[PDB]
């Protein structure tokens, strides 16, 4: 017969091998396939779905009051409402989202994102905001005057009720420590809120996030969310 010899590494057991196996029950026909709607083939079809974030980054905000920031008529004309550190791995507004739970299983991520805000006041109420994006080089601005000189849009929520902000490029890893300052999306008040004498004086915002079609993930590990 054919003359053989054994290699080193003969009879071991890797957990990550791809070989055939002995069937338990030959001549057994399983139930045939049926068209069940909504098949997913790739886990980047899940991170490209919009999912709201926790804008209200104050302490002792318990419950579903974390998903909204209140602006009122008795507020000042130049103060910031929020800022989002664009760190997926760290604690903050982007931890418990849909893009920040799938990318805990993988080590490296790189791609562009897409944020969306939505104003939930009455039909009569007007005013303007300003949405500043800071690149990973510079730091977060503290006044509205020093924030205007970056990249900004002046959003009038008396006509529109939704805006769209495109984040150009983020990336990150785990580096066995941790990176920081990948960007900030801060929002200042431009004019004060104007409500009539019949609507309420308190309005609210809601923020969304979803990855674009060039997001990417690599080197799967195990998540620390449940361990």
């Amino acid at each position, epitope marked *: 017969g054919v003359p053989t010899y054994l290699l080193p590494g003969s009879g071991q057991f890797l957990t990550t091998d791809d070989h055939s196996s002995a069937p338990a029950l030959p001549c057994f026909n399983p139930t045939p396939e049926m068209h069940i709607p909504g098949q997913v083939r790739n886990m980047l079809e899940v991170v490209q779905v919009e999912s709201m974030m926790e804008i209200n980054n104050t302490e*002792s905000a318990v419950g579903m009051e974390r998903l909204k920031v209140d602006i009122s008529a008795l507020t*000042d004309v130049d103060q910031l409402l929020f800022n989002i550190p664009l760190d997926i791995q760290l604690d903050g507004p982007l931890r418990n989202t849909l893009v920040g739970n799938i990318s805990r299983y993988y080590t490296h991520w790189s791609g562009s994102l897409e944020m969306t805000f939505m104003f939930c006041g009455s039909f009569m109420a007007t005013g303007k905001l300003i949405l500043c994006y800071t690149p990973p080089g510079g730091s977060c601005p503290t006044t509205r005057e020093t924030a205007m000189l970056g990249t900004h849009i002046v959003w009038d929520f008396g006509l529109q009720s939704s805006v769209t902000l495109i984040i150009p490029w983020i990336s990150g890893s785990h580096y066995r420590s941790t990176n920081a300052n990948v960007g900030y999306v801060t929002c200042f008040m431009q004019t004060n809120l104007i409500v009539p004498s019949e609507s309420s004086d308190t309005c609210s915002l809601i923020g969304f996030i979803a990855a674009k079609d060039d997001f990417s993930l690599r080197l799967m590990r195990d998540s620390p969310d449940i361990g």
Partner: antibody
Amino acid sequence: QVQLQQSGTELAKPGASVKMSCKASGYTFTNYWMHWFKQRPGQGLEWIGYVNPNTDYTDYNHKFKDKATLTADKSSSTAYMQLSSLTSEDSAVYFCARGTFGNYASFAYWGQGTLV
Amino acid sequence: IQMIQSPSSMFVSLSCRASQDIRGNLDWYQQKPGGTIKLLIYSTSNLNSGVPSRFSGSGSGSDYSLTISSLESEDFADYYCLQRNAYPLTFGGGTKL
């Protein structure tokens, strides 16, 4: 940092007049109304009036209509309040507060007081 | 308009009534014995930017109330209430706490 710096204390004989000041610094003057208060010691506060530094238009409480006058100064950023015909009942501490950008009369920033 | 302060001293659900209805529109101020005043609650339910969370306010048509859960050492200061419905502005009495 917003500061409201008032003058020191003084007193006067009954029948005379006296003038105070509440110099404001740290924000944009001529946008916010400047209110004025009175606290007789051992009692609560009381509203006197205000002055609009943008249009120089005032409005007084009905009780203090004939006692106090209210002016404003854009160059030195100072709000004055001059009393008239002092008696023994006009001895209290006197406060100054800042309103809101939307003229809603909320009083986040205050002064320290001027004893008469 | 006249407002009353229903307790005069307390040694923590202090409340205040009013002559009319004021449609919210009520603030809560606190005066330290040094001579410094800062507000705590505005428009009868919100909180100021820079106050600890223990303080809370309740609302109604005309009978409003402040509520503290747990006390504190330098919490001991008298509390005032202000209506801003119509001029002139009227304060309360104050509870020496």
